[PDB]
Design a protein around this ligand. Structure first.
Ligand SMILES: C=CC1=C(C)[C@@H](Cc2[nH]c(/C=C3N=C(/C=C4\NC(=O)[C@H](C)[C@H]4CC)C(C)=C\3CCC(=O)O)c(CCC(=O)O)c2C)NC1=O
Ligand SMILES: C=CC1=C(C)[C@@H](Cc2[nH]c(/C=C3N=C(/C=C4\NC(=O)[C@H](C)[C@H]4CC)C(C)=C\3CCC(=O)O)c(CCC(=O)O)c2C)NC1=O
Ligand SMILES: CCC1=C(C)/C(=C/C2=NC(=C\c3[nH]c(/C=C4\NC(=O)[C@H](C)[C@H]4CC)c(C)c3CCC(=O)O)/C(CCC(=O)O)=C2C)NC1=O
Ligand SMILES: CCC1=C(C)/C(=C/C2=NC(=C\c3[nH]c(/C=C4\NC(=O)[C@H](C)[C@H]4CC)c(C)c3CCC(=O)O)/C(CCC(=O)O)=C2C)NC1=O
Ligand SMILES: CCC1=C(C)/C(=C/C2=NC(=C\c3[nH]c(/C=C4\NC(=O)[C@H](C)[C@H]4CC)c(C)c3CCC(=O)O)/C(CCC(=O)O)=C2C)NC1=O
Ligand SMILES: CCC1=C(C)/C(=C/C2=NC(=C\c3[nH]c(/C=C4\NC(=O)[C@H](C)[C@H]4CC)c(C)c3CCC(=O)O)/C(CCC(=O)O)=C2C)NC1=O
Ligand SMILES: CCC1=C(C)/C(=C/C2=NC(=C\c3[nH]c(/C=C4\NC(=O)[C@H](C)[C@H]4CC)c(C)c3CCC(=O)O)/C(CCC(=O)O)=C2C)NC1=O
Ligand SMILES: CCC1=C(C)/C(=C/C2=NC(=C\c3[nH]c(/C=C4\NC(=O)[C@H](C)[C@H]4CC)c(C)c3CCC(=O)O)/C(CCC(=O)O)=C2C)NC1=O
Ligand SMILES: CCC1=C(C)/C(=C/C2=NC(=C\c3[nH]c(/C=C4\NC(=O)[C@H](C)[C@H]4CC)c(C)c3CCC(=O)O)/C(CCC(=O)O)=C2C)NC1=O
Ligand SMILES: CCC1=C(C)/C(=C/C2=NC(=C\c3[nH]c(/C=C4\NC(=O)[C@H](C)[C@H]4CC)c(C)c3CCC(=O)O)/C(CCC(=O)O)=C2C)NC1=O
Ligand SMILES: CCC1=C(C)/C(=C/C2=NC(=C\c3[nH]c(/C=C4\NC(=O)[C@H](C)[C@H]4CC)c(C)c3CCC(=O)O)/C(CCC(=O)O)=C2C)NC1=O
Lengths: 172, 160, 61, 162, 161, 227, 98, 160, 172, 160
């Protein structure tokens, strides 16, 4: 597991030189944005169980055959497993937002998630539909200017949007 | 197109084009402004026309997507929608050519040999194009829906 | 021809004792089931179409 | 699913032993009470559309807010009332599946396991479904031990929700 | 158009001599495999459509000749393939029965590679289709019968190259 | 009386040592009952036992074991008797034992219980006759009395996947819940008539002429974004 | 290619028209002229007609100019009717033999 | 039969029958005793060959019998087995005729037009005949099962 | 594990369809043959160790190269394993005879069994004839009428035959 | 390959192949087992050999990736690594062909005209291949690194 600072340390550890004085200015620009980072995470971790169930409900109206009798997410054993499966993806996306780099997203979550949907028979294209349902709810809640000073945060919600559509192309 | 087979018709007959042929090449090119608008509607609606096209296709033919169906799994279902994107594209060619000549020699000539040789139910793919037709004609007015739907049902006729 | 009527002229008659006990499996009481892997594919549940007949089946007389 | 047959098989390969006469009597008592069971599952299937639409109306008469509150969890829409009627279709179908195999196997597999996690995620009150099942329990019209078998799997569905 | 018996009779006749021990020695060798060839030609007639469906799906089904721009895109062009592959599996069956590949170059090979160059048909993908078709044919008829039917497939692939 | 089939070992990460004194970040969190937890910290052990022996799915209300949970909190049984109650639990039979054979169930009960991968495929052959002769209750206590269970878990540790990652690296191996799911491809494909008949919904429509061919620079844009 | 002349297989299988009628109507069809008339020259169309409606090649030079001028003036419908209505067709095939 | 098309072959060629044609009419009529025994086995096994034939057909294709399938209900399922009784009958004709000529002009020529025009999945009826083939060849020895199965798979080939 | 009743239910819940009235009667057909279903199994487990040792001796009246030095079933660990596997296969087909379908037979025993023996080196078809030496030692043992009265029950012993040759082709 | 130009050499000279030519075709085909192992190492190491190849290339030539460099931005840098994937592929061809004949007529003949006409510094792409060479030879033993590196430096020589 790395954070954003660890990928600059461990890169030049393989090159073996000291960290340059123009690379410190890139790390100090990150800690100036370090407190706008912490309320993108606090906005999405607090409405976490309503990002999930409002995105599942939007999925099951577009593709109604996933919940009809003989469908994949039909029973009450497997509706709960489908609802869990978006909670785990939203968990590791917010983990990779607070670290700054995606090295824990594709390690404990996406490392072979595609190959276990071929074994389970789960439609992997429909999990990537319901991740982009959750991307549209989470970047709208990271623009919420209540209890926070007004400023430009467009470069950090575009990084949160990057970890959502990385986990969508890794299941199809 | 209407221009090329009105020529090859009068070509075979050792003659030039009659007023009946030249008052329609004339009538077709003045129709050309309205044709590009119609094809322009279907051009950037392929996301909905195809995806909702395969919507009703699976609800009406769950066998083809069920285990044992030809389009079963994540793989075949993607190709299951790929063919609908093909046939939706050829209808845009037929609308601009003013004839099913583009649809004739692409996707229609010998189509039963392909789908029979692929194991695909040819009646099933005919059901898919009909589902796309209701989505397409729902995107246009009545004067246009008599055309865009008009090319689909020709494809329905030749596909069975 | 009148001695052979109504029994031997009906080729579908001989399998009616088996094809309407082969087809007495998984009956559906409300509207909606035979979901078949998660699609709609519903029911008609009338007296006619529970026997599978159509408009071309009483009009054949 | 747990039938009386498949639990008599299950204790055999628990020890890895052969099927003795401590399991043939378990299948023998199942065959006694299956003649008062399939006469119950026939009558619940035959009067299924009477029981389902009567049980949707028993919820709406007791809880009239559900027919008029706005929001997705309530049956105040056209599609809210259809999702309510197929839910009581699902609760009647697992009762007649449990009467056929003679045990609580199908509704353990399909209804019960995972039920709390979807009634909490979709804001469905479990007192709605007890009222939908209490209408069935004393208005199926059965009489006797055929009634006594339908009132043990409807009552098993109630005690999960209760 | 000569079979093994026709070729043996021709060479023995072209020198004006009778059928000596060497000419009949090969003829006896052909009659021994006469039972194998008919059963080989039997199952190939039964699974003609299944063999061609297996070859194209195994060799050139999803390659970009199948996609737009590729040599097999339009339905007329796709339908010409399985029509075209049917001759290779059919004429190879004739060579397997006749025991002599004279019928292939007489009726298939001559003007064939000169025709595909005219149409622009890719000879590379064609041979791999026949190679894959040869691979499935060894599945049905067995090993030695596949060796016989396979001996005429690569004869087509060699001359078509 | 028929000893086990003498299989062979292989090369793995758990049978060497790490030289990791003061291990930094990827430690897999030894929950234990010798650290004397509080009643809110017994609850963080019982969730780790449910996540290890089941997956993260089957921690439902019906799959909880509320009488086995209370005997852990009274210190009546150990962790080793608590893992044995979870494999012999009736949710673990009908969800993870009725839907695969004996040669895949040994791959579950060595990945989750012992925390290591299987050595080779003969070990699945060498272990699967224990389940068919004396049963699943005879299979777990001969798997919990091995030296690989006692020399790094013992009587007080909920097990874990030992040495999943290499300490200078960041990729490592696959987690075992994402390695072996509830059922495999061989149980799913044979039942496509009664169960598992779903047919797949429609993918997002990509047009065919926008796909990259050999010699297109759009096949290297994922390389350039990792620069 | 799944082509179909159901009307012509009708009128020939019943015997309403000859094979020669069925062959001539096949020649004046549009699936023919799209196949062996459009992609070629009137020069090459004349030789490809003889291989089909006569089963032989051209014989002389004057046999070309007689049949090129006909195709030159009446196209496909004038050429194929001038082959099917010749004597050489009738001597080999009259009304019944393909 | 082999007798009628070995004639019409040599009929068209303006010639008599060669030894290759007359040593097989000869070889076929001595085979006639063994053919009637094979057809006699399938004649009074139609109760099991058809009913078990539709056994595996519904287990392999539940869509056709499910609600919405073509053979849904008590009615269509009876006709669903009626066609299998037809095709099982034609195989008895082909075995005695020594050729699929009886099966050719009955149940094979233009069969795709009928079943496409009836809404029946032609691939589904092909699955039905394959299920009958395993039941039929299970009723005979290996020397016979290479024949009785041999006529079914021809019907499978022409039916797709 | 499904018995004969659960296989009807699992096919009807997958389509979301109730049970019909004529499918209840075919399961009510099964319970009036309930004593005849049960007392077949009261033979084949009560003489069960006789069926093992009679068939295992008579296999080496047919193929004595297994007990040859160098052969597969030569040694006393391997002779104890050959009587083990024929005791297990006889045990699961008694479980399927009390069930009514073979779903416990091909989920426990026969699933993935060919690939065991080819990785073991055991001859595949040479254990299938040991199964067919147990069927005629049991279907003749089922037709014996000791203690029970007389009625036509050839339909049930065909299914008892029908498990032994379903299991025979799964090891070849 | 060594087989094709040992032929066309003796072809031009109106003669057959000498022992010097035929004892090396012989010596090359016995070398063929070891060549496929070497090319098999570079085949599924292109992820590291290319990505670490462009690693040292940018650290040694930051101008080409800096703003104004030819490979500037997300776009050109992807194509910046695409060419290295090309040249790494041709080296796998040269190793199996036993000669730079595949590398000669692909990626070497007229290469200066292309890169001069694309605005790319040809010296910069030469630096890229050298960085790939150190990664490639670090993946193989000394006996192999004298070959895999041997084909890179030929590409270095012709690329300047
Ligand atoms: C542990 C809890 C914890 C938090 C929740 C944050 C909360 C937080 N954010 C800011 C400070 C800020 N917070 C924002 C954030 C936003 N403005 C917007 O318009 C967006 C809606 C939103 C984030 C997406 C900005 C833009 C600033 C800096 C003000 C500026 O530079 O203009 C500050 C003041 C810091 C300072 O004065 O230096 C604090 C305490 N930090 C924490 O430690
Ligand atoms: C512990 C297990 C157990 C059993 C096996 C049965 C034993 C049993 N079988 C029968 C009764 C019967 N049992 C059989 C069975 C057979 N008769 C034959 O000739 C065959 C050898 C054999 C079947 C293969 C038949 C056919 C009857 C009915 C008698 C009749 O036909 O009149 C009865 C009398 C009442 C009844 O029908 O149930 C009893 C107690 N009951 C049990 O509790
Ligand atoms: C380590 C982190 C982690 C990952 C990445 C993970 C994936 C994962 N998803 C699973 C199941 C599942 N996933 C789904 C999800 C869906 N099916 C649908 O129809 C929808 C399209 C979609 C979501 C809405 C379902 C229904 C199952 C249950 C499989 C079953 O019981 O049949 C399973 C099997 C049981 C489970 O643990 O939930 C795994 C292992 N599990 C993990 O523990
Ligand atoms: C422009 C005219 C045109 C068409 C139509 C066309 C079709 C076409 N469909 C194919 C496959 C396929 N097509 C399907 C289609 C379906 N499955 C179903 O259940 C449905 C009924 C149906 C779609 C609505 C499937 C499943 C495959 C893959 C078959 C296999 O993998 O064996 C393939 C082979 C793979 C490929 O190259 O794409 C071609 C060439 N090509 C063309 O040039
Ligand atoms: C077979 C086992 C099984 C059960 C028990 C089950 C329950 C279930 N009920 C649901 C919804 C629902 N259930 C209701 C039902 C009601 N609301 C009312 O006002 C009425 C009082 C009441 C009952 C008549 C409504 C309105 C929804 C939609 C809520 C939503 O989508 O947010 C959903 C969400 C998905 C959907 O169907 O749209 C599930 C999973 N599903 C199953 O597969
Ligand atoms: C009996 C000996 C014999 C052969 C073999 C033969 C071949 C032959 N192949 C043809 C076309 C064709 N052949 C193909 C074949 C292919 N496309 C591919 O990508 C594959 C590599 C290949 C299938 C294996 C295609 C696509 C055409 C149509 C070309 C066009 O329309 O331009 C044509 C043009 C006319 C027509 O098909 O009606 C002839 C005459 N003729 C003969 O008399
Ligand atoms: C069954 C008995 C057994 C074997 C056979 C075994 C092999 C083994 N060698 C390993 C690593 C290794 N092996 C080497 C050795 C070398 N690399 C070099 O560059 C040198 C050329 C060479 C030695 C001079 C290195 C450096 C690692 C660690 C890789 C790393 O952590 O970066 C690892 C990875 C885990 C670890 O860090 O120890 C295993 C499992 N381990 C065992 O327990
Ligand atoms: C365009 C004007 C036109 C018509 C109408 C026409 C009819 C026509 N109908 C025919 C046969 C036929 N027509 C039928 C029709 C029927 N059987 C019934 O029971 C129904 C009452 C009826 C359907 C409505 C049948 C069964 C045959 C085949 C007769 C046979 O094989 O002996 C034939 C014999 C050849 C063939 O079909 O290939 C011709 C020529 N030809 C024409 O040129
Ligand atoms: C001797 C050659 C021959 C055949 C084969 C034949 C078929 C034939 N099948 C028919 C109907 C039918 N056939 C089916 C068949 C099926 N449904 C399914 O799901 C299965 C896939 C399939 C059977 C295995 C059905 C459902 C009907 C009634 C269709 C309707 O009522 O609309 C009918 C119309 C009713 C009748 O007159 O029987 C004919 C003529 N006739 C012939 O002369
Ligand atoms: C799911 C139920 C189940 C089955 C069916 C099963 C089979 C099974 N049979 C085995 C061995 C064996 N099986 C046999 C049996 C035979 N070899 C012969 O030559 C004869 C044909 C036949 C005896 C009549 C022998 C000799 C071995 C010992 C192989 C060895 O130890 O090397 C082994 C290897 C472990 C061992 O017993 O040593 C397994 C896993 N295990 C199970 O859990
Ligand atoms: C197999 C032999 C072979 C090669 C080598 C080859 C190269 C090649 N390089 C290209 C572009 C390019 N190549 C570069 C390359 C570089 N920029 C730098 O700073 C570096 C010094 C250098 C790479 C290490 C750039 C930036 C472009 C895009 C130029 C532009 O967009 O104007 C293009 C045009 C786009 C394309 O079709 O890919 C070709 C054809 N083609 C071939 O067939």
């Amino acid at each position: 597991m790395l954070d954003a600072f660890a990928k600059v340390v461990a890169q030049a550890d393989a090159r073996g030189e000291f960290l340059s004085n123009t690379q410190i200015d890139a790390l100090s620009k990150m800690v100036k944005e370090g407190n706008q980072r912490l309320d993108i995470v606090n906005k999405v971790t607090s409405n976490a169980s309503a990002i999930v169930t409002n995105s599942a409900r939007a999925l099951f109206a577009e593709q109604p055959q996933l919940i009809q009798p003989g469908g994949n997410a039909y029973t009450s054993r497997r509706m709960a497993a489908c609802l869990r499966d978006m909670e785990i993806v939203l968990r590791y996306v917010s983990y990779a937002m607070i670290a700054g780099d995606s090295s824990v997203l594709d390690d404990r979550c996406l490392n072979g998630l595609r190959e276990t949907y071929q074994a389970l028979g789960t439609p992997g294209s429909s999990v990537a539909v319901a991740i982009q349902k959750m991307k549209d709810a989470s970047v709208a809640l990271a623009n919420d200017t209540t209890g926070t000073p007004i400023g430009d945060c467009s470069s950090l919600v575009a990084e949160l949007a990057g970890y959502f559509d990385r986990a969508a192309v890794s299941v199809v | 197109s209407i221009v090329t087979k009105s020529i090859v018709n009068a070509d075979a007959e050792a003659r030039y084009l009659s007023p009946g042929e030249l008052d329609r090449i004339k009538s077709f090119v003045l129709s050309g402004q309205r044709r590009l608008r119609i094809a322009q509607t279907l051009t950037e609606n392929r996301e909905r026309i195809v995806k909702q096209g395969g919507q009703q296709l699976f609800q009406r033919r769950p066998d083809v997507v069920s285990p044992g169906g030809n389009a079963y799994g994540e793989e075949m279902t993607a190709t299951c929608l790929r063919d609908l994107d093909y046939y939706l594209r050829l209808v845009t060619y037929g609308i601009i050519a003013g004839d099913v000549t583009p649809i004739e020699e692409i996707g229609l000539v010998g189509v039963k040999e392909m789908y029979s040789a692929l194991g695909t139910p040819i009646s099933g793919v005919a059901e898919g194009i009909r589902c796309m037709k209701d989505v397409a004609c729902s995107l246009l007015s009545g004067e246009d829906a008599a055309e865009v739907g008009f090319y689909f049902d020709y494809t329905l006729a030749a596909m069975q | 021809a009148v001695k052979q009527s109504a029994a031997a002229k009906d080729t579908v008659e001989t399998w009616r004792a088996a094809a309407k006990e082969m087809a007495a499996m998984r009956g559906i009481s409300p509207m909606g089931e035979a979901y078949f892997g998660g699609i709609a594919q519903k029911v008609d549940n009338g007296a006619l179409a529970q026997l599978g007949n159509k408009a071309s089946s009483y009009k054949k007389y | 699913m747990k039938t009386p047959i498949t639990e008599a098989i299950a204790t055999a390969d628990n020890q890895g032993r052969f099927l003795s006469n401590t399991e043939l009597q378990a299948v023998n008592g199942r065959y006694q009470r299956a003649t008062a069971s399939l006469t119950a599952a026939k009558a619940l299937t035959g009067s299924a559309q009477r029981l389902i639409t009567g049980a949707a109306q028993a919820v709406y008469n007791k809880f009239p807010y559900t027919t008029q509150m706005p929001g997705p969890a309530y049956a105040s829409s056209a599609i809210g009332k259809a999702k309510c009627a197929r839910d009581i279709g699902y609760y009647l179908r697992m009762v007649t599946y449990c009467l056929v195999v003679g045990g609580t196997g199908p509704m353990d597999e399909y209804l019960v396991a995972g039920l709390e996690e979807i009634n909490r995620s979709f804001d469905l009150s479990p007192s709605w479904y007890i009222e939908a099942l209490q209408y069935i329990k004393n208005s199926h019209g059965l009489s006797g031990q055929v009634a006594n078998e339908a009132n043990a799997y409807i009552d098993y569905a109630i005690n999960t929700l209760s | 158009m000569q079979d093994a018996i026709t070729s043996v009779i021709n060479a023995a006749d072209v020198q004006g001599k009778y059928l000596d021990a060497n000419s009949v020695e090969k003829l006896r060798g052909y009659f021994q495999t006469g039972e194998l060839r008919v059963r080989a030609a039997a199952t190939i007639a039964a699974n003609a459509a299944t063999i061609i469906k297996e070859a194209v799906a195994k060799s050139l089904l999803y390659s970009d000749i199948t996609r737009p721009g590729g040599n097999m895109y339009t339905t007329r062009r796709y339908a010409a393939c399985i029509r075209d592959l049917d001759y290779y599996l059919r004429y190879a069956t004739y060579g397997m029965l006749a025991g002599d590949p004279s019928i292939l170059d007489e009726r298939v090979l001559n003007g064939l590679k000169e025709t595909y160059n005219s149409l622009g048909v890719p000879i590379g993908a064609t041979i791999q289709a026949i190679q894959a078709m040869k691979e499935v044919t060894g599945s049905l008829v067995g090993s030695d019968a596949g060796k016989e039917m396979g001996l005429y497939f690569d004869y087509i692939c060699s001359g078509l190259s | 009386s028929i000893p086990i089939l003498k299989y062979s070992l292989s090369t793995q990460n758990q049978r060497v040592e790490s030289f990791e004194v003061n291990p930094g970040d990827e430690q897999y969190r030894i929950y234990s009952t010798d650290s004397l937890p509080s009643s809110s910290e017994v609850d963080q052990i019982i969730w780790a036992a449910y996540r290890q022996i089941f997956s993260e799915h089957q921690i439902l209300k019906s799959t909880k074991q509320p009488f086995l949970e209370s005997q852990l909190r009274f210190n009546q049984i150990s962790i080793k008797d608590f893992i044995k109650g979870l494999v012999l639990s009736a949710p673990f039979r009908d969800l993870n034992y009725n839907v695969n054979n004996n040669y895949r169930f040994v791959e579950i009960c060595v990945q989750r219980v012992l925390g290591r991968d299987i050595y080779n495929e003969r070990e699945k052959i060498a272990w699967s006759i224990i389940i068919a002769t004396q049963g699943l209750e005879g299979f777990i206590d001969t798997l919990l009395n091995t030296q690989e269970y006692l020399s790094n878990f013992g009587d007080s540790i909920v097990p874990f996947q030992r040495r999943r990652i290499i300490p200078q690296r960041s990729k490592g191996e696959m987690p075992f819940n994402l390695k072996t799911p509830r059922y495999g491809i061989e149980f799913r494909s044979k039942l496509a008539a009664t169960q598992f008949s779903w047919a797949s919904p429609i993918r997002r429509f990509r047009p065919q002429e926008q796909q990259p061919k050999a010699g297109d620079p759009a096949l290297f844009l994922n390389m350039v974004q990792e620069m | 290619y799944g082509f179909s002349f159901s009307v012509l297989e009708s009128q020939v299988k019943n015997g309403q028209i000859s094979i020669k009628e069925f062959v001539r109507s096949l020649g004046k069809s549009s699936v023919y002229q799209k196949q062996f008339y459009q992609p070629y020259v009137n020069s090459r169309v004349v030789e490809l007609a003889f291989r089909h409606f006569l089963g032989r090649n051209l014989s002389s030079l004057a046999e070309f100019q007689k049949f090129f001028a006909i195709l030159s003036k009446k196209g496909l419908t004038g050429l194929v009717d001038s082959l099917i209505n010749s004597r050489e067709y009738s001597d080999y095939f009259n009304e019944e033999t393909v």
